[PDB]
Amino acid sequence: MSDFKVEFLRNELEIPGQYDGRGKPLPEYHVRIAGFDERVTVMASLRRPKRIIIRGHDEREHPFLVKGGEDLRQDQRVEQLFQVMNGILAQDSACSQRALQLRTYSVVPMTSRLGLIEWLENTVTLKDLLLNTMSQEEKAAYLSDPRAPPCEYKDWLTKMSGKHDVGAYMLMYKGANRTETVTSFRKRESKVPADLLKRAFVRMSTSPEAFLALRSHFASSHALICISHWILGIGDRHLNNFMVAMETGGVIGIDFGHAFGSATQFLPVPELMPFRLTRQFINLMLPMKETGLMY
Amino acid sequence: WDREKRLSFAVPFREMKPVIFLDVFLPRVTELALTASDRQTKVAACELLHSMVMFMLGKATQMPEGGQGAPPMYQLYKRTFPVLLRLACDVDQVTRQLYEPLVMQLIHWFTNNKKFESQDTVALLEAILDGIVDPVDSTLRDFCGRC
Amino acid sequence: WDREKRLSFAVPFREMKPVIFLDVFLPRVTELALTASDRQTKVAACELLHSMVMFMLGKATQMPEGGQGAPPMYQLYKRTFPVLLRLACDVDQVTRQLYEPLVMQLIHWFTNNKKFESQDTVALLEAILDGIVDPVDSTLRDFCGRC
Amino acid sequence: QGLIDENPGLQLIIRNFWSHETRLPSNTLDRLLALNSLYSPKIEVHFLSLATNFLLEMTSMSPDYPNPMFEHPLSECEFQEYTIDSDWRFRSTVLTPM
Numbered sequence: 001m002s003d004f005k006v007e008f009l010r011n012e013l014e015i016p017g018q019y020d021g022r023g024k025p026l027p028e029y030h031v032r033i034a035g036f037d038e039r040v041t042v043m044a045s046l047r048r049p050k051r052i053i054i055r056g057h058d059e060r061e062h063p064f065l066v067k068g069g070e071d072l073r074q075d076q077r078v079e080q081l082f083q084v085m086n087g088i089l090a091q092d093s094a095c096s097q098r099a100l101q102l103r104t105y106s107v108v109p110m111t112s113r114l115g116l117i118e119w120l121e122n123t124v125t126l127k128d129l130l131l132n133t134m135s136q137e138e139k140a141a142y143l144s145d146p147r148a149p150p151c152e153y154k155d156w157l158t159k160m161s162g163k164h165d166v167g168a169y170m171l172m173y174k175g176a177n178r179t180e181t182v183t184s185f186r187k188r189e190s191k192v193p194a195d196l197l198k199r200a201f202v203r204m205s206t207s208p209e210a211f212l213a214l215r216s217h218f219a220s221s222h223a224l225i226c227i228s229h230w231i232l233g234i235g236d237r238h239l240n241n242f243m244v245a246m247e248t249g250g251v252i253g254i255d256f257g258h259a260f261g262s263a264t265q266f267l268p269v270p271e272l273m274p275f276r277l278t279r280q281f282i283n284l285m286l287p288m289k290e291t292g293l294m295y
Numbered sequence: 296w297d298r299e300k301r302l303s304f305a306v307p308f309r310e311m312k313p314v315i316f317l318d319v320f321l322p323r324v325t326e327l328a329l330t331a332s333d334r335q336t337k338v339a340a341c342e343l344l345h346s347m348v349m350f351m352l353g354k355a356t357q358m359p360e361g362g363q364g365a366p367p368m369y370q371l372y373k374r375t376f377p378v379l380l381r382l383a384c385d386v387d388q389v390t391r392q393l394y395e396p397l398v399m400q401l402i403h404w405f406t407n408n409k410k411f412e413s414q415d416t417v418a419l420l421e422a423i424l425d426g427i428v429d430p431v432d433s434t435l436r437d438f439c440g441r442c
Numbered sequence: 443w444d445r446e447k448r449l450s451f452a453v454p455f456r457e458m459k460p461v462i463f464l465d466v467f468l469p470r471v472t473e474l475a476l477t478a479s480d481r482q483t484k485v486a487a488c489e490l491l492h493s494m495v496m497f498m499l500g501k502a503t504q505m506p507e508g509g510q511g512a513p514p515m516y517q518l519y520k521r522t523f524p525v526l527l528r529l530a531c532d533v534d535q536v537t538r539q540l541y542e543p544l545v546m547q548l549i550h551w552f553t554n555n556k557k558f559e560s561q562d563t564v565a566l567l568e569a570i571l572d573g574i575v576d577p578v579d580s581t582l583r584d585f586c587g588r589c
Numbered sequence: 590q591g592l593i594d595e596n597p598g599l600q601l602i603i604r605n606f607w608s609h610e611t612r613l614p615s616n617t618l619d620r621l622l623a624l625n626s627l628y629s630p631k632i633e634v635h636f637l638s639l640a641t642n643f644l645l646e647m648t649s650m651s652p653d654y655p656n657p658m659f660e661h662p663l664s665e666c667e668f669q670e671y672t673i674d675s676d677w678r679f680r681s682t683v684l685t686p687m
């Protein structure tokens with residue numbers, strides 16, 4: 001990665017996977033590698049993938065995710081799908097009139113154990129965004145200073161008859177009568193701060209007209225993603241697995257190691273929920289339930 | 296144009312010191328200064344933007360925060376430098392006599408013992424080296440070359 | 443103690459803003475803060491010098507001048523740092539609880555990404571490494587070692 | 590002469606009497622000019638501290654009196670409250686191993 005430069009006796013490497021079916025290509029206009037750079041960092045999530053940087057002959061950055069050991073064949077195929085969903089969405093009146101499209105993005109399965117997955121620049125994950133709306137005083141409730149889990153959940157497992165951290169859920173579904181689990185879940189759902197995402201968009205927005213619009217596109221793009229993720233049975237909708245496209249303010253559903261029902265098939269902790277409509281989204285729509293614009 | 300309010304400006308009253316954040320005025324004042332067809336509006340919108348970019352440089356140079364991320368106002372500089380070029384070689388001669396010297400003045404300041412390494416100058420350089428490219432203006436490119 | 447007046451301080455009046463140059467008070471206030479035998483004078487002379495060295499750091503950090511010679515207030519720093527040591531480990535416990543933390547606080551600030559190369563820190567280092575030598579005090583040397 | 594009086598309570602009432610904006614003017618020039626009338630030699634050892642106590646305390650009401658001198662701190666850092674013993678003590682008065 002230090003040794004690679006533009007030199008003769010080498011086929012100049014066009015930037016990976018930039019070729020697509022959207023019109024005739026103009027191949028020589030596609031970016032090509034000038035070189036790698038003396039910079040790296042590792043992402044927090046369990047396979048510790050890597051924010052590599054490429055400089056192109058355009059004298060421009062392509063920050064990129066290397067992911068690997070996981071086979072990007074599945075991730076490529078779950079995007080072919082999303083490209084054809086943008087296809088029908090652009091091509092029926094009920095969705096062209098609403099300007100409805102997902103964002104897909106480029107996977108490229110560079111080997112059976114790699115891909116250079118494109119980083120969307122000027123974006124942040126929804127958990128990063130959420131904590132970034134908190135003050136140091138509510139952040140104490142995730143530093144886990146008021147109780148050893150952020151909300152009581154891991155310790156409250158003992159009241160729910162579950163002892164250990166992993167798999168103990170396998171017991172609670174036995175005696176989890178509606179009344180005790182709802183009333184205790186409602187006590188936690190009512191602990192964690194009000195109006196966090198309302199605060200996120202008030203911070204983004206210039207003025208009330210710009211807020212009303214930005215709100216609607218987040219909730220619209222979010223809505224379309226969560227049905228289409230359901231349609232292909234994807235799961236593990238963890239709050240790092242969404243990004244706010246921070247310029248346009250829309251949601252992007254980020255990754256798919258558990259596509260095609262395979263999230264809920266895998267035994268040790270079953271996923272009952274088909275997709276995500278949680279509290280800070282209901283709180284984003286507050287004066288009307290999810291039965292409004294989302295529905 | 297920014298994630299959090301820069302330009303916090305205390306209005307000189309006698310009883311009190313209420314605060315205006317001037318970075319709400321730029322998105323409209325920049326459009327007036329270029330595109331106002333009424334000439335008297337245009338020049339007054341320029342001298343507001345001039346005094347407001349003087350305010351900008353000063354407030355940044357008090358070091359409201361010293362790096363450790365996006366330098367304060369880099370996100371403004373990235374958005375106001377291309378406006379400053381398009382508006383030096385504006386037609387209106389009263390505008391040109393005000394901003395040709397100001398861009399060269401900025402261009403001097405943005406080479407300096409500390410600041411030559413700053414992303415303030417990266418934003419500046421890539422603004423001007425997008426300036427020379429412009430697909431719809433012949434006089435912008437000449438100016439950006441001389442810049 | 444200096445060739446030209448640093449510390450130009452505009453008194454907060456309602457009609458007007460007259461200017462005091464505070465660097466005339468130091469030569470007497472430093473002597474009071476150490477050597478005043480009346481205890482009530484002593485502590486009040488300390489909290490003036492504390493607030494006046496807070497003023498000092500701030501006024502220098504606005505960059506009244508950025509080098510190109512003796513840094514502004516280096517000549518004050520060279521004269522006030524040895525006073526600050528002698529006056530942390532003063533006997534009087536009300537004085538000690540005010541200046542032991544302040545010298546460690548200064549000593550943190552005077553290591554930093556820009557300022558670690560500054561003669562502000564050379565003056566500081568050579569003040570403390572004259573502190574450990576003192577031929578007539580046993581407790582100053584211990585403190586300057588811990589510094 | 591009541592302006593040097595031995596009891597700090599009466600010393601304060603006569604100070605507060607002259608400080609009033611009808612006894613002794615509020616604009617800084619006429620205050621500075623008027624203070625020359627607040628003298629007779631029996632006060633002289635105290636006078637300079639009184640004249641300055643009448644000028645700076647005109648700032649006790651000024652719009653800048655509660656403003657910060659510099660807007661923000663030296664860099665990213667965080668601050669706390671504190672307390673000082675200030676009661677009965679000079680350091681050199683209690684034995685080591687106790």
Ligand SMILES: Nc1ncnc2c1ncn2[C@@H]1O[C@H](COP(=O)(O)OP(=O)(O)OP(=O)(O)O)[C@@H](O)[C@H]1O
Pocket residue numbers: 043044045046047048049065067070105117118119120240241254255256257
């Ligand atoms: N397009 C993207 N733009 C920016 N960040 C991304 C993007 N795609 C993935 N990430 C980052 O990569 C990290 C993990 O890799 P990725 O999401 O692709 O695979 P994953 O199987 O879901 O990994 P993991 O389960 O560990 O989160 C994410 O947590 C996120 O920080």
